[PDB]
Amino acid sequence: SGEYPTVNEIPVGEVRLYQIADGVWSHIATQSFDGAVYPSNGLIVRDGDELLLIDTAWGAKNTAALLAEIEKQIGLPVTRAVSTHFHDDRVGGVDVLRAAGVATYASPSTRRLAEAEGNEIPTHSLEGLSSSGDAVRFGPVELFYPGAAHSTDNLVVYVPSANVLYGGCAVHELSSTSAGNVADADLAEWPTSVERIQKHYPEAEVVIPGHGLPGGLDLLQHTANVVKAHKN
Ligand SMILES: C[C@@H](c1cccc2c(-c3ccc(CS(C)(=O)=O)c(Cl)c3)c(C(=O)O)[nH]c12)n1cc(CCCN)nn1
Ligand SMILES: [Zn+2]
Ligand SMILES: [Zn+2]
Known part of the structure; x- marks a missing residue:
C-alpha cells in the first residue's frame, strides 16, 4: 500500500511496480536460488509512447508476469531492454522478452559471459562501454561502465530527466551487512x-x-564500506 515492497510481501511469480519519478518505475520480483528466496529490482523508463526496460524479473515466468503488470499499470509497449550484467536476475527472461517483440541489448562482455554461463543471451551488443568510465546514451537513459565490482561487466543506468541512478548489483541497499553474492565479484576494485x-x-x-x-546517494558510500569490510 505505497511502501517499497519487500521479499516477504511478493510471492515468487508475482511482480510489483513502484513509481520512482515521472516516467520512471522500478519493478520488484522474487526468486528462489540455492534454497533461499531473494527480491530483485529492475527499472522501467518511459521513452515517449514506448518503454525501455532495464533488467528482467529473474526468470521466464517472472518476466512474463512483469510484462502483464506493465500492461495493467502503464499500458505502453516495452520495445527495448538492457541487461546490466550476465547473471540470471538480469538476463533470465530475455527469451520471453525476445518472443514478445522486445529488442534485447547488453554489452559484448555481458553477452559472452551469459553464453559461457548457460544463461539467456541478449540479442544486440552495446559497444562503447568496454573501458571504465565509459558512457553511452540509450533512449532516455545513460549507460555507464564503472569498472569491475559485483561482476566484471556490471553497468549502471542514469535517468537524467529525474536524476535517478540505478546502480544494479554494484550498489547495495542501506540495510545490507555483506557484499551479497560475491562469486564473480572483484572486491579490490569495487x-x-x-x-x-x-x-x-x-x-x-x-x-x-x-x-x-x-x-x-548514501547507498554508494555504504556499498563501498560493506565491500571493503567483506574483503577484509
Ligand atoms: C543470480 C545471482 C544471485 C542469486 C542469489 C542471491 C544473489 C544476490 C544477493 C543479493 C543480496 C543479498 C543480501 S546482502 C547485500 O548480502 O546483505 C544476498 Cl545474501 C545475495 C546477488 C547480488 O548480490 O547481486 N545476486 C544473487 N547470482 C548468481 C551468481 C553466481 C552463479 C554461479 N553458478 N552470482 N549472483
Ligand atoms: Zn549478479
Ligand atoms: Zn544481483
Whole structure:
C-alpha cells in the first residue's frame, strides 16, 4: 500500500511496480536460488509512447508476469531492454522478452559471459562501454561502465530527466551487512568503481540498488564500506 515492497510481501511469480519519478518505475520480483528466496529490482523508463526496460524479473515466468503488470499499470509497449550484467536476475527472461517483440541489448562482455554461463543471451551488443568510465546514451537513459565490482561487466543506468541512478548489483541497499553474492565479484576494485559512480553522478537524487530498498546517494558510500569490510 505505497511502501517499497519487500521479499516477504511478493510471492515468487508475482511482480510489483513502484513509481520512482515521472516516467520512471522500478519493478520488484522474487526468486528462489540455492534454497533461499531473494527480491530483485529492475527499472522501467518511459521513452515517449514506448518503454525501455532495464533488467528482467529473474526468470521466464517472472518476466512474463512483469510484462502483464506493465500492461495493467502503464499500458505502453516495452520495445527495448538492457541487461546490466550476465547473471540470471538480469538476463533470465530475455527469451520471453525476445518472443514478445522486445529488442534485447547488453554489452559484448555481458553477452559472452551469459553464453559461457548457460544463461539467456541478449540479442544486440552495446559497444562503447568496454573501458571504465565509459558512457553511452540509450533512449532516455545513460549507460555507464564503472569498472569491475559485483561482476566484471556490471553497468549502471542514469535517468537524467529525474536524476535517478540505478546502480544494479554494484550498489547495495542501506540495510545490507555483506557484499551479497560475491562469486564473480572483484572486491579490490569495487570501491574504486563505486568512487567512479560517485564522481560521475553527483546530482543523483534517488539511488536504486540491484536488490532491496532505494535511497539516496548514501547507498554508494555504504556499498563501498560493506565491500571493503567483506574483503577484509
Ligand atoms: C543470480 C545471482 C544471485 C542469486 C542469489 C542471491 C544473489 C544476490 C544477493 C543479493 C543480496 C543479498 C543480501 S546482502 C547485500 O548480502 O546483505 C544476498 Cl545474501 C545475495 C546477488 C547480488 O548480490 O547481486 N545476486 C544473487 N547470482 C548468481 C551468481 C553466481 C552463479 C554461479 N553458478 N552470482 N549472483
Ligand atoms: Zn549478479
Ligand atoms: Zn544481483
